[PDB]
Amino acid sequence: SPEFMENFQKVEKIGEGTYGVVYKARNKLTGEVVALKKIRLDTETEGVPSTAIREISLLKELNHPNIVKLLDVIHTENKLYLVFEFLHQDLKKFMDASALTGIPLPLIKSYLFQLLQGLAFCHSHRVLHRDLKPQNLLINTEGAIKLADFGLARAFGVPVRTYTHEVVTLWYRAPEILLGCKYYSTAVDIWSLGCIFAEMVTRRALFPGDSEIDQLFRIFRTLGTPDEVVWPGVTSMPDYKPSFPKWARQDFSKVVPPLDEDGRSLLSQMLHYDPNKRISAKAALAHPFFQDVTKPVPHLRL
């Protein structure tokens, strides 16, 4: 039986991702609470590009405990309403609420482990997230964390307006993208998650840049300016300039003080400059940092 928007009662705005406001709503017929996303389509040109349609189809095929569940898609007047399972809060809000104490290590480990499981699944199905950040990660009272707000629209020219509040995506952007690589790989998601891992541990974003070049320099100042030894081919990348300053790599004892050899070993592999050497999500799941991983239940108030 088709669902119609009249079937839903808005309860409250719970967020605003790359597609604007996200509303918690109640299904009038079943009483099920859901999250609704409003997509405004603009046939600016001929329509959604074939490749974009295929990528949307690929994302839709994914069924995994660590990917927010899309329950239905309602079409009406030049608009689409995405009906998703309802999740209480995002990782960004949770970290801010835990900033003065910090998210406990067992939870950090559980969330990282789960995000790697979700990414491994996506990557094996040829799906990348492309815009991983704390704001697009959803957590439930059960202790699960899920991927949401995939960067598909801006990555494949989907004719749909994006954004609402602003932008801060640069902070988690992989260096090969900042250097203008012709083709990037699944490794870009691992870099972003590595930045998130460090952020949960230190309680502060790792590379909070304000422009592409500022983002690059913040990365270089911490991990060292890459050269051909560390990253073969870096000096020939489209936007690489020999004039870049030369910074030496900093010790992780300074970058992420709380972490030990296991956590630092894993983080170093997730932030490797060379995409071909950066650890994969599948390999990361086998890292010793996860030997004692559990599934703690977070404490959240509303």
Ligand X SMILES: COc1ccc(O)c(-c2nc(N)nc(N)n2)c1
Active site (catalytic) residues: 131
Choose which of 8, 14, 205, 256 interacts with ligand X (CB under 6 A): 14
Closer to ligand X by CB, 70 or 237: give it: 70
Query: Any contact of residue 18 with ligand X (CB under 6 A)?
Result: no
CA distances 133 to 52, 90, 93, 253, Å, are 22, 10, 12, 24
Answer with the entry of ligand 2AN, ligand X, none that 56 interacts with (C-beta below 5 to 8 A by kind): ligand 2AN
DSSP string, the chain: ----GGGEEEEEEEEEETTEEEEEEEETTT--EEEEEEEEB--SSSSS-HHHHHHHHHHHH---TTBPPEEEEEE-SSEEEEEEE--SEEHHHHHHHTTTT---HHHHHHHHHHHHHHHHHHHHTT-------GGGEEE-TTS-EEE---SHHHHTT-SB---SS---GGGG--HHHHTT-SS--THHHHHHHHHHHHHHHHTS-S---SSHHHHHHHHHHHH----TTTSTTGGGSTT--TTS---PPPPHHHHSTT--HHHHHHHHHHT-SSTTTSPPHHHHTTSGGGTT---PPP----
Given 5, 59, 71, 300, the residue binding ligand 2AN (CB under 6 A): 59
Contact of residue 59 among ligand 2AN, ligand X, none (CB under 5-8 Å per partner type): ligand 2AN
Q: By CB under 6 A, tell whether 84 contacts ligand X.
A: yes
Is 149 annotated as belonging to a binding site? yes
The binder of ligand 2AN chosen from 5, 21, 70, 74 (CB under 6 A): 70
**Least CB distance from residue 169 to ligand X, whole Å?**
15
Per CB under 6 A, which of residues 125..184 are in contact with ligand 2AN?
Answer: 148-150, 152-153, 158, 160
Tokens, residue 31:
């009483």
Among ligand X, ligand 2AN, none, the one that 22 touches (CB under a kind-dependent 5 to 8 A) is: ligand X
Closer residue to ligand 2AN, CB minimum distance, 90 or 199: 90
Residue whose tokens read 């490797």: 272
Query: Annotated binding residue at 267?
Result: no
What token pair was written down for 101?
């104490």
How far apart CA 266 and CA 287 sit, in angstroms, is 7
Smallest distance, Å, CB 52 to ligand 2AN?
7
Q: How far is the CB of 167 from ligand X (least distance, A)?
A: 16
For residue 173, the minimal CB distance to ligand 2AN (Å) is 18
Give which of ligand 2AN, ligand X, none residue 80 binds (C-beta under 5 to 8 Å, depending on kind). Answer: ligand 2AN
19 assigned binding-site residue: yes
Among 13, 28, 40, 60, binds ligand 2AN (CB under 6 A): 60
CB of 196 to ligand 2AN, least distance (A): 17
User: Is 22 near ligand 2AN (CB under 6 A)?
Assistant: no
Asked if 212 contacts 171 with a C-beta cutoff of 8 angstroms, the reply is no
Q: Is 71 in the site for ligand 2AN (CB under 6 A)?
A: no
Is 18 one of the annotated binding-site residues?
yes
The binding site comprises 14-22, 37, 85-87, 90, 133-136, 149
Residue ranges in contact with ligand X by CB under 6 A: 14-15, 22, 35, 37, 68, 84, 86-90, 138, 148-149
